[PDB]
From a paper:
Human respiratory syncytial virus (RSV) is a nonsegmented, negative strand RNA virus (NSV) that causes lethal lower respiratory tract infections and continues to pose health threats to infants, the elderly, and people with compromised immune systems worldwide. The RSV genome encodes the nucleoprotein (N) that forms helical assembly to encapsulate and protect the RNA genome from degradation, and to serve as a template for transcription and replication. N consists of 391 amino acids with N-terminal domain (NTD) (residues 36–253) and C-terminal domain (CTD) (residues 254–360), which is one of the most abundant proteins that forms the helical assembly with viral RNAs to provide protection from degradation and to participate in transcription and replication as the template. The RSV-N protein consists of the N-terminal lobe and the C-terminal lobe linked by L14 that is conserved among all negative strand RNA viruses.
We prepared the RSV nucleocapsid assembly by recombinant expression of the full-length N in HEK293 cells. Final three-dimensional (3D) reconstruction yielded the RSV nucleocapsid of roughly one left-handed helical turn of 10 N protomers at 3.96 Å resolution, with the top view resembling the decameric ring architecture as reported in previous crystal structure. Modeling of individual N resembled the previous crystal structure with well resolved density for protein side chains and RNA bases and similar secondary structure. All nucleotides were modeled as uridine due to the random composition of cellular RNA, with each N bound to 7-nt RNA. In our nucleocapsid-like assembly structure, we observed seven nucleotides encapsulated in the overall positively charged cleft of each N protomer, with four bases facing outward and three facing inward. The positively charged residues K170, R184 and R185 in N-terminal lobe form electrostatic interactions with the phosphate backbone of the nucleotides pointing inward, whereas S313, T315 and Y337 in C-terminal lobe form hydrogen bonds with the phosphate backbone of the nucleotides pointing outward to the solvent. We observed that Y88 in β3 and D221 in α7 of N interact with R234 in L13 of N + 1 via hydrogen bond and salt bridge, validating the key role of R234 in interaction interface. In addition, we identified interactions between Q26 in L2 of N and Y38 in α2 of N + 1 through hydrogen bond as predicted by previous study. The absence of Y38 phosphorylation in our structure suggests that viral transcription and replication likely utilize less compact nucleocapsid template.
Numbering used by the authors:
A (entry chain A), B (entry chain D), C (entry chain B), D (entry chain C), E (entry chain E): 1 to 362
The structure:
Amino acid sequence: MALSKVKLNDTLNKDQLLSSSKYTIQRSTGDSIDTPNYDVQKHINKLCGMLLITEDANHKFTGLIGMLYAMSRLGREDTIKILRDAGYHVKANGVDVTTHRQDINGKEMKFEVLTLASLTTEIQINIEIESRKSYKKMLKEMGEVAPEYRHDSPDCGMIILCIAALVITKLAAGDRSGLTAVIRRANNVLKNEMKRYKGLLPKDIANSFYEVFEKHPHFIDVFVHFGIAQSSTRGGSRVEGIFAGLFMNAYGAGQVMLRWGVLAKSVKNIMLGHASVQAEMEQVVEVYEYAQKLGGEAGFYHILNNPKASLLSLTQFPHFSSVVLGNAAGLGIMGEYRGTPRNQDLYDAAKAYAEQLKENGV
Amino acid sequence: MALSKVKLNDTLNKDQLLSSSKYTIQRSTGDSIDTPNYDVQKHINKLCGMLLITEDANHKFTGLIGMLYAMSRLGREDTIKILRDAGYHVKANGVDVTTHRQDINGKEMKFEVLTLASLTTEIQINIEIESRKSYKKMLKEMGEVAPEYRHDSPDCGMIILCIAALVITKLAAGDRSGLTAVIRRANNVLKNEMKRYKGLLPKDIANSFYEVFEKHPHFIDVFVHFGIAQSSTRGGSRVEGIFAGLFMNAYGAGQVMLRWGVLAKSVKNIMLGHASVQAEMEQVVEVYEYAQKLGGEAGFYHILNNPKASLLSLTQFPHFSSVVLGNAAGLGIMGEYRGTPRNQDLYDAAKAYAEQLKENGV
Amino acid sequence: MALSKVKLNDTLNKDQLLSSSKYTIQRSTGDSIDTPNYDVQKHINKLCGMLLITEDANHKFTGLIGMLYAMSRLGREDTIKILRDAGYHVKANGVDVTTHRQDINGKEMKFEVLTLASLTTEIQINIEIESRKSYKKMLKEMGEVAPEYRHDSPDCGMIILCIAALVITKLAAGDRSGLTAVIRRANNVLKNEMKRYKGLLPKDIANSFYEVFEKHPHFIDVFVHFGIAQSSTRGGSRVEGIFAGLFMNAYGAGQVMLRWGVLAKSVKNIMLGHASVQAEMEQVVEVYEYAQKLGGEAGFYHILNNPKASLLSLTQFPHFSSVVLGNAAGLGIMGEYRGTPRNQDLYDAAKAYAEQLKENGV
Amino acid sequence: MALSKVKLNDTLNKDQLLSSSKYTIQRSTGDSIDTPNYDVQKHINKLCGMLLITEDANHKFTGLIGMLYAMSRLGREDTIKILRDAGYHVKANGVDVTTHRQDINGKEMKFEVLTLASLTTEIQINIEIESRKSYKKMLKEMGEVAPEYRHDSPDCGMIILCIAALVITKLAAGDRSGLTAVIRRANNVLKNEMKRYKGLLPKDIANSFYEVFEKHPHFIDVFVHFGIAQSSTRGGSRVEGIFAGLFMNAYGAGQVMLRWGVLAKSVKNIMLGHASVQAEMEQVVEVYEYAQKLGGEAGFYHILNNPKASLLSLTQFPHFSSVVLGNAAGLGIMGEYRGTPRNQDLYDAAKAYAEQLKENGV
Amino acid sequence: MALSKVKLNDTLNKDQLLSSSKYTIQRSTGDSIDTPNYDVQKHINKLCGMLLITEDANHKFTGLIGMLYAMSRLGREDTIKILRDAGYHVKANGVDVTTHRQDINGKEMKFEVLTLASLTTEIQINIEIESRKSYKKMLKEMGEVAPEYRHDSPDCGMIILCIAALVITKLAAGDRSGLTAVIRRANNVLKNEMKRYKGLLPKDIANSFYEVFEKHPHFIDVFVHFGIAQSSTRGGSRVEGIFAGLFMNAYGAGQVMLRWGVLAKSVKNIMLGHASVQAEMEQVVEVYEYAQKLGGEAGFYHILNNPKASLLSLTQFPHFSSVVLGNAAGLGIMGEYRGTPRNQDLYDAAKAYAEQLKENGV
RNA sequence: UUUUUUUUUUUUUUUUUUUUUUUUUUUUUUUUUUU
């Protein structure tokens, strides 16, 4: 009857507001960050292969190198386009290949290097020298190495970006907490690669990536759109296939409570007949409809500092949050989720109901 | 049938009337309030950092200083634009950096200061001296301070503006009543900051802000639009993140009764079958439609002296107001809302119904 | 079918007729009523403050003084404009500040006074003397008065105009009947002001205002447009905000029956199925449409002698009027509305239905 | 299809014909009827006040006197203009104030009188003498009379013109039939006036007015336009409002059948499905459209001998007239309307239907 | 498509033809018919009053006398103008008042008479003598007669012209057939006049008028334009309104079939789907458009011998005429219209349909 | 060929207004596991 139209869609109104605000704040530093093109991908892959075959190398700039691989795989104009869509005021320090001369210990030698505002030909040739030394050492004691053991093979950048995906998985919390689980998974898979190569320091690579993402954030959006584009394609090697599964596994972070609530719904937890949640039913329905409307680009918000993610938190609905938490904990799956309820009574009640309901499960 | 068009939209008619009145009253004082630009933000941030690291400093002009930070972050032309939209007759006393000479206790020293019609180089250098003294004292007994303990770090203005948001939350009542809850929340959060710095007098900062807002009101609109613009952006630090959540938490003040009425609706309180509210159903529906039409810019009205807010008060609908109050109190959530009903009988009846309905909740 | 166009819009035809009549009657007295400008507002506010702080003063010309405050706040040209729109033939006796010399009891003293065709410097200095005497008396027995206790504060004219709004509320009846309710409300609010000052004689002020409005009517339109303009603004204090709520509360006088009819509609009173009102349905619909078309400037008609208000009276529809009256009385809200129905049977029937319907209200 | 344009608008054709006839008949008597101006209004009001305060005076020329008041309130040029628009051949015997000398019973006294072609200074001084005598008698037995009891007050002419409006109400029939209802309505109100003054002979005033309107007709148009102009104004008193309501109540005389037909339509009387009225539907629609087109100046036709009023009579549509009559009589509101139907069967049928439909009205 | 322009407007072509024929036939008798002016109207009215008050007078020349009254009311120049527009070759025998001497039975007496080429002073004085005799007889047996019983009153000519209008009503047939209905109506009205006077022989007056119109036709056009001019005026009495209504009632004679066809259309007679009338639809539409174009001066054609009236006869459309006749007769309103159809089958069919449709009328 | 009957219009009731009433007032950052 007439009551049905008594409503208030504060969420939609906030959305409209933040979408149309008429004003803007600016930093506009004016940086001149680099951007390569399709050409130097081969040199970069060879470099990553050297840095992989070499043992115990200081995997410091590895995350940077992988981001450069990504930008080269993408394209100058496309990178610039997404950056301008993101709203930046930066420039394109074009990259250029060149030879470097160095009288190494009484020998003039040619050295393939790239001009950059962040790299140094010194460390480049150091890397190349160490790779050459341990590579000839590897040639010793067997006579020859396979093609799948040398820097020339093409899967190196994808191997690094797999770890990058493992890190962007847990960057939601992003406090160097999930490093242990990251290492655990990276050893659970990639065993073939860990035996085929040796310059694999997962902890060091992850720390490097953490530093990179903590300082320069725009690489986040870069890597995101790169992974999305790579997934949409159907081409690539075995590593590219695993990479896509890993990347997509990190969909929908900072949104777990919604799915757990759907879970407790599908289990038919009795406690939802309580008036204290039957009230909030309306608003929770409305936010669910909002998420359904947004559809695709919904899971990657909390990855970023996108301000519209705060809407999708049921922490403001304490009774609902607490009952869902109690249900999931009674199911014995909330391993170490450092959350908290509000109505401890409802939490304990739902937990007791669930554990009672499971043991007598036919 | 024919009865459906018997209507009278007094609210819309009042809206049209006040929108088009043909006349205006003016004060037009002719003040020459200052306005900085993007340049001096660094000096101001350093100043706020000094005033933060220093202990037990008289946080008197801190609210003013934060407003100056805000105007500098915004822009001269934008501030002037919003002021003219607000309908002011003021001028732009441009700010200028300069050095000040002072033979401090037998030593001529240079002193970074800004010409202003509100500030004094004397108190500026006093602040700087006190900061330097306690900073070298902090350098004692440890040997060195971290970069996150010195005035040079960039989060100071945002730290102050967080408290500013906590204050504009309760400025709706605006009688220095919510100061206790403000302090409570400011200690519930910002514990990291309270340990990282020491010049934190929340009560004093809040009193300063109260004085500032009580005297000069235009800073209200300034701070509002500033927070809105900052929220719409996404590029920010952790402090900028917390600030946006805090600011948005103060959306929709002086409108709580609408949401509580929606609550009592969603609970299906039996008492709304009463004819004495079935009558007023029409007008309450109409005002709800008006609010839905206005959409976004609806919650910030009561923050201001905007005259159109008086429409959105259901106090003129006594039966509806009383039943909603009784329902919410029966739910045991109306903590200390100093309201009053009219039909005490309906109030008590709804409260009894609700408390009866909760205890037997399955 | 063809019957739908059988119609007769006597209301619209009367409207057109009275709008275009080709002739006019004139009085054209040729008065020289005064008009100040923005300058003397401060002196007038100080005068009102004196007349407020002084005790038991004969609040005789207070309504006149408040109207002068209003004209000064408005502007000479604007007052003249609205008067010419109202169709007057008066002149502008310009006001001028000056000093007056008077050897008070052996002392020559200067006296701030304004030349006027209504005021006298004698009574002006009498007021000032009494204010000074009781002000120094107030300074006794405490040592000092606060700034919010002296004539210098700026809220005096608004304080008077609040009572003016309370009076123009009930001026529709305008027979000195609502004075009791006026006093009741004026004591229900303004308690802070009644304790902060003492020259508050609400009955005397109201009688003064009644005399003023009974004699000079043009001040009615003046005060109306003044209140409208003040409400549209936002820059104001507590008193200014209260004033606007009070003024707007008097919207739509002599039109209560329409809203009560809407009420009885929303309650679905069974008696409207009667043919004796199903007939008049058409004309009542038409007048409702006329009111909806006029929209804003509809509620202030009965305040004035505007001749077009007689249309908006359902007294000519006796059956409808009587049923609405009976319904509202059965709801027990028609307190003392000295009205009368025509069909006493329908009146009693609707009342019985309503009271039957309320007691069994679920 | 093609049938829709088979039409014949005899009404419009008659209208065009009578509007353009090329010829004219003339009487052109050449009278020299008087016309005053704004000056003598005060003397005339004093005279009417004398004739009101005096008891049992022969209210013979009172209607004439009121018409003179009206012409004085209007203006010489305006009266002449409307008369020439009406198509007269008369002159303007200008009025002039003067003193008259008369040795009353051994005393020479001055007597304010006006030269006129219809008045006599003798009867003027007789009136003044009688007023003076009973006025001093009224001064006896109380000591003093109020200002609202003497001839000097300004509402006398309006008091007379109220009765004039009551008479022009029923002048449509204009056979001295409605005198009883007129007296009843003069006692329904004006009770305050009947107690405040005593020279009130409603029957005598009405007979005087009847004589005046029966002889001189042009005063009809005069009084009409006067009332219209007075209504359009707003500046007035209680008597002025009363008068306007009374005057407008006489709008639309000799047109009641149209409104009663609209009534029977809005009730949905079943009998209109009869073919014998479905036929005449077209012409009745056409005349209704004609009336809607004329709009405003439609109700005052039957007041005059304007020849175009005969169009707006549904007596020529016997079936429609009879069914409407039967419906209205079945509603029990056609009190004493001395009409007649044609199809007595349809009349009785509709009456039976209506009375059947009312008693079972839910 | 192309077929729409296949047309033939024989009616318009005949109209153009008869309008422009280039030739003329003439009689040009050269008569010297009289014409009075405004002066003798009073004498003529007195004469008619004598001839009315006198009993059983031979109302032989009464129609002539009334026509002379009409010409006197019109004007010499205007009569001559309309006659020349009608295309006559006559002269103006001016009328002149004079006294006649006659030694009546031994008494020389003065006798008011007018020189005329049709009248005789002998019969004039005979009329006057008879009037005087029966007038003094009327003075007997009551003592005095009222002013509304003597020849001096002014309504006599209008009283005669009312009967003249009743006759010109039925002159369309003009075979002394409608005399009975004429007498019936003349007794249905004018009862007041029939009791107030006695020289009223309606049959004799009508026979006189028939003779006059049968012999001299130009008086027809005279009387027509006179009635039209009198109707357009408004300044009149009861007899004038009566006369105008009567005159206008005779509008549109010899055109009844058009209106009856419109009637049968508005009833939606099924038989018009027949192809035999769907064919003639075009031409009947065209003549209807022609009549609509002519507009006003359309109804008075058949009154005259104007040759253009033969167009407006649907007798040449036999199927349409017969179906309309059958419809109207089935409605039971074609009382005694001595017409005839052509398609008797269609006539009977439509009649049966109509009478079937009426009895079952809801 | 054409035309073809019926008929003046008006008629009752009635000024309008009339009550109650400033609004605000509470709590709250969000994220956190497994593949």
